Nucleic acid binder design. Sequence first.
DNA 1: AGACAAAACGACGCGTCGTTTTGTCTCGGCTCCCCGACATTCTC
Length: 49
Amino acid sequence: MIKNILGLALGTNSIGWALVKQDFENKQGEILGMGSRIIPMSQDILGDF
DNA sequence: AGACAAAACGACGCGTCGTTTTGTCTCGGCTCCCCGACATTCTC
């Protein structure tokens, strides 16, 4: 009935993390946490790999 | 090729050593104490 959901988006050097507490059946719910973790490296590596 | 490290450019721009030159409160009235020197007399 109430569900904790963790959405993860994975990039070349980025992790997008979001955590929500959804109750879809009643059109309710709210977000709990959001963030993006970045691993720095030059775009030379991005164009090279 | 990328993106960081720093040299280069700018007119601009202000600091900096070594010396020279400049600027720096003013006058009025009195009173009463002390001392110094130089003349005379007098004592020793």
